[PDB]
Curated annotation (Swiss-Prot):
The chain holds residues 90 to 419 of 419 of the full protein. Residues 17-328 form the Peptidase A1 domain. It is an enzyme of class 3 (hydrolase). It catalyses: Hydrolysis of proteins with specificity similar to that of pepsin A, prefers hydrophobic residues at P1 and P1', but does not cleave 14-Ala-|-Leu-15 in the B chain of insulin or Z-Glu-Tyr. Clots milk. This is Endothiapepsin. It comes from Cryphonectria parasitica (Chestnut blight fungus). The active site is at D35, S199. Its EC number is 3.4.23.22. GO terms for biological process: proteolysis. The keyword Protease applies.
Length: 330
């Protein structure tokens, strides 16, 4: 089997992407944030504290003839941005782009933190990291991909995120029309539960390529590119007036600037992030100070190849017995 679904930016800045997901019988369609940096499929629901729901579409398990309470199971997750959610668990039928899993754990939120409530466009998350990170207790549950894998034509999914435009998540096949050149594959460590890999270096604009190993995670659920302070300083030094602002929470730059590109290495291959992808707009409405899309990972504890990086590539998440990651230009 295969599946193919369009993913759409939630706003004009590509702060996140939503993908429609069918849950239950009859189908209830929710727009979920596909997150290769976590491993829980959780939804706003009829069980979510009413004051914490503000415009989201909810899953109502009592209206699904295929929903079954997973007795005794609870979940609770905290994300790198400080947000969190928790609740109980159902199993139900879940379909993405024509690909159907029966008996998928659907984690129903009883509580969500303010950031989730305040974002009316995201109805929940669909985790695509390794199932070892799944938070369901006392019996850990499998991700959608893990449950689908054996049925797929090939044990892969691909992320093709758009810049200020829709893109595609495919399951079970590689669309050879969706990228240019060849796909370069690189080793993955699953030791931390992430799609963790090592970039071979970077360049800033038309500058020379610096060969240096940068370990980090391919994370569709993180907006920006978080890299070591040395790398980030080298980037922003090429932008007149750019500075790190402790009050704002990162590098800012004059909105009048033309940003240079940023290149990262995948083996001997190179992915170029155009400068415009690195512009996240005014820090506050009407400001002429703009927020940068490349930020320091210092104090996160891990480098994160988030959407800013991934949207410059066609990315293969290869879930073979030994997983690997593939990157192509597009």
């Amino acid at each position: 089997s295969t599946g193919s679904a369009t993913t759409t930016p939630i706003d004009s800045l590509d702060d996140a992407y939503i993908t429609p997901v069918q849950i239950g019988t009859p189908a209830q369609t929710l727009n979920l944030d596909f997150d290769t940096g976590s491993s829980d499929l959780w939804v706003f629901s009829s069980e979510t504290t009413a004051s914490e729901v503000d415009g989201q579409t909810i899953y109502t398990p009592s209206k699904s003839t295929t929903a079954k309470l997973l007795s005794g199971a609870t979940w609770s997750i905290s994300y790198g941005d400080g947000s969190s959610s928790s609740g109980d668990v159902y199993t139900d039928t879940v379909s993405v782009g024509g690909l159907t899993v029966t008996g998928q754990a659907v984690e129903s939120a009883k509580k969500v933190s303010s950031s989730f409530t305040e974002d009316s466009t995201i109805d929940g998350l669909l985790g695509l990291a390794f199932s070892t990170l799944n938070t369901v207790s006392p019996t850990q549950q499998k991700t959608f991909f893990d449950n689908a894998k054996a049925s797929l034509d090939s044990p892969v999914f691909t992320a093709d995120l758009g810049y200020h435009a829709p893109g595609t998540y495919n399951f079970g096949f590689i669309d050879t029309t969706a990228y240019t050149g060849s796909i370069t594959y690189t080793a993955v460590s699953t030791k931390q539960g992430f799609w963790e890999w090592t970039s071979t270096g970077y360049a800033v604009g038309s500058g020379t390529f610096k060969s240096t190993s940068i370990d980090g995670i391919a994370d569709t659920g993180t907006t920006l590119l978080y890299l070591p302070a040395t790398v980030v300083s080298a980037y922003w030094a090429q932008v007149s007036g750019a500075k790190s602002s402790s009050s704002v929470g990162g590098y800012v730059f004059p909105c009048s600037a033309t940003l240079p590109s940023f290149t990262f290495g995948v083996g001997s291959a190179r992915i170029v992030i155009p400068g415009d992808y690195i512009d996240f707009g005014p820090i506050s409405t009407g400001s002429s100070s703009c927020f940068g899309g490349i930020q320091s990972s210092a104090g996160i504890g891990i480098n994160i190849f988030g959407d800013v990086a991934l949207k410059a590539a066609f990315v293969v998440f290869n879930g073979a017995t030994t997983p690997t990651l593939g990157f192509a230009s597009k």
